């Protein structure tokens, strides 16, 4: 079995002493089923390529264990050498095109099954056969919550356009003229108390009426502005979905990217009207999803295009990140195999059976629907 490190589906952790990891337990008391996977170390380009046995666990590992339980076979799990799912890339010898990553490893005979979040599409299906999809999900965009955060206690009312200084100058002038008028008319403390409390308590009457009306209409406008602010006003410059002008009209100010040599890359390449997006993204496409997510968290990025099943989980885990509710190119995660093979029909039937009962729902509860907020 060949698989890749995707956090919601395949966690990869170092062993404790020799081919073993800490025997964790779920919060419901059920132990976590971990398997031994022989894979390369963290750094691919700048570190030597020597294999180490780590331990993998998660959604895909539980599904693989269930498959091995139902269809009686044993497995030997190892990680793909490079962190690429697999695309048809030009090789600089003989001007040919070849498969890399998990697709290349499976087609070359190095593996017999790809148990990983492998997207089903026409490009891959021409060379390998997928099972019935064990996950249904589309592509989506990961962003953050505001530049830093939202305002707490609305900055005690932002007083948008307060023009408060001119209002205070007007009230000062009115108070001064009131004192002058009262002194002329046939009482410093009484006038001062009246000037302050006039908001709540021949010519003095009419001045009181007009001042009461003006303060009344001012407070009405103030209540209306607070209500309008806290009913509708809340987004400040959000990149709402993929249709936002920031992504539709690319610029170097706003940076968005995806994972190099993945399904999203060839999806953007295949489409004709997204050529501008593909050109803007190909400059700084990341090596793996975790690195891109960290860059989004570190503000080196501004939006990340990736599978919904992963981005929604990452948003659930990390409260400072968010995902738009949009979805596009809805697809499925299935299990890859070679050309016609004895395991194909039984793998598809087992996945369908797991969908029919609650086993896939149990896995979603255990690994995807367990959130912290």
Partner 1 sequence: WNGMIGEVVYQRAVMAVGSLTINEERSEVVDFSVPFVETGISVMVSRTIGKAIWLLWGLVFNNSVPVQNPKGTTSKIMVSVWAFFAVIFLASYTANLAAFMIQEEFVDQVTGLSDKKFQRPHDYSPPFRFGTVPNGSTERNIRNNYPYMHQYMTRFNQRGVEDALVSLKTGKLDAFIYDAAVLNYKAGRDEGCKLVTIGSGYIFATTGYGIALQKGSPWKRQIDLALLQFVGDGEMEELETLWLTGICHLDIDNMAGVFYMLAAAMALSLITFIW
Partner 2 sequence: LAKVVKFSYDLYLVTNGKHGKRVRGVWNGMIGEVYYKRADMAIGSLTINEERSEIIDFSVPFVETGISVMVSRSTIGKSVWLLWALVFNNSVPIENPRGTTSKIMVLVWAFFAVIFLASYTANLAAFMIQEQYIDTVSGLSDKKFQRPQDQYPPFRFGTVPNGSTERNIRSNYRDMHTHMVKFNQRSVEDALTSLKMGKLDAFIYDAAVLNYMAGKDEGC
Ligand X SMILES: *[C@@H]1O[C@H](CO)[C@@H](O[C@@H]2O[C@H](CO)[C@@H](O)[C@H](O)[C@H]2NC(C)=O)[C@H](O)[C@H]1NC(C)=O
Distance CA 117, CA 334 (A): 7
Residues in the chain: 373
Task: Determine, following the binding rule CB under 6 A, whether residue 41 of this chain makes contact with ligand NAG.
Answer: yes
Task: Determine, following the binding rule CB under 6 A, whether residue 88 of this chain makes contact with ligand NAG.
Answer: no
φ and ψ at residue 272, rounded to 5 degrees: -90, -35
Distance CA 195, CA 175 (A): 6
Task: Determine, following the binding rule CB under 6 A, whether residue 346 of this chain makes contact with ligand NAG.
Answer: yes
41 touches 47 (CB < 8 A): yes
Distance CA 283, CA 83 (A): 18
**Residue selected from 17, 28, 72, 93 as contacting ligand NAG according to rule CB under 6 A:** 93
Residues 85-144 that bind its own copies (CB under 8 A): 101-103, 106-107, 112-121, 123-124, 127-141, 143
**Residue selected from 328, 343, 359, 370 as contacting partner 1 according to rule CB under 8 A:** 328
| Residue 47 interacts with which of its own copies, ligand NAG, partner 1, none, CB < 5 to 8 Å by class | ligand NAG
Residues 56-85 that bind ligand X (CB under 6 A): 71-72
Distance CA 104, CA 125 (A): 13
Q: What x/- string results for residues 40 through 79 when contact with partner 2 is judged by CB under 8 A? A: ----------------------------------------
Residues 95-124 that bind partner 2 (CB under 8 A): 120
How many residues contact its own copies, by CB under 8 A? 80
346 touches 337 (CB < 8 A): no
Distance CA 121, CA 272 (A): 17
| Residue 115 interacts with which of its own copies, partner 2, ligand X, none, CB < 5 to 8 Å by class | its own copies
> For the chain, where are the E strands, in sequence order?
2-3, 11-13, 35-39, 52-57, 78-79, 88-91, 96-99, 114-119, 129-130, 135-144, 256-257, 303-307, 321-323, 328-337
Nearer to ligand X, 71 or 176 (CB): 71
Distance CA 166, CA 32 (A): 67
Site residues (vs partner 2, CB under 8 A): 120, 130, 132-133, 136, 157, 193, 196-201, 205-206, 209, 212-213, 216-217, 219-232, 245, 249, 253, 330, 332, 348-349, 352-353, 356-358
């Amino acid at each position: 079995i060949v698989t890749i490190h995707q956090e919601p589906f395949v966690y990869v952790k170092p062993t404790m002493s020799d081919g073993t990891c800490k025997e964790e337990f779920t919060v419901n008391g059920d132990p976590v089923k971990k398997v031994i996977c022989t894979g390369p170390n963290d750094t691919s380009p700048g570190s030597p390529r020597h294999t180490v046995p780590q331990c993998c666990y998660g959604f895909c590992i539980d599904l693989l264990i269930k498959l091995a339980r139902t269809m009686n076979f044993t497995y030997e799990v190892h990680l793909v050498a490079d962190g690429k799912f697999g695309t048809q890339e030009r090789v600089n010898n003989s001007n040919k095109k070849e498969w890399n990553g998990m697709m290349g490893e499976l087609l070359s005979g190095q593996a017999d099954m790809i148990v990983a979040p492998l997207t089903i599409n026409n490009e891959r299906a021409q060379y390998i056969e997928f099972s019935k999809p064990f996950k249904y999900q589309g592509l989506t965009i990961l962003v953050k919550k505001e530049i830093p955060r939202s305002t707490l206690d609305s900055f005690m009312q932002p007083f948008q356009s307060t023009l408060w200084l001119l209002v205070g100058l007007s009230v000062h002038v009115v108070a001064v003229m009131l004192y002058l008028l009262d002194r002329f008319s046939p009482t410093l403390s009484s006038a001062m108390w009246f000037s302050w409390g006039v908001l709540l308590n021949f010519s003095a009457r009419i001045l009181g009426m007009v001042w009461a009306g003006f303060a009344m209409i001012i407070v009405a406008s103030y209540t209306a502005n607070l209500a309008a602010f806290l009913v509708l006003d809340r987004p400040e410059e959000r990149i709402t979905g993929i249709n936002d002008p920031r992504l539709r009209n690319p610029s170097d100010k706003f940076i968005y990217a995806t994972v190099k040599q993945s399904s999203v890359d060839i999806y953007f390449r295949r489409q004709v009207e997204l050529s501008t997006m593909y050109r803007h993204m190909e400059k700084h496409n990341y090596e793996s999803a975790a690195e891109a997510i960290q860059a989004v968290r570190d503000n080196k990025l501004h939006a990340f295009i990736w599978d919904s099943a992963v981005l929604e989980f990452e948003a659930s885990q990390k409260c400072d990140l968010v995902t738009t509710g949009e979805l596009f190119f809805r697809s499925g995660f299935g299990i890859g195999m070679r050309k016609d093979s004895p395991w194909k029909q039984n793998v598809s039937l087992s996945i369908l059976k797991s969908h029919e009962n609650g086993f896939m729902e149990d896995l979603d509860k255990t690994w995807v629907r367990y959130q912290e907020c």
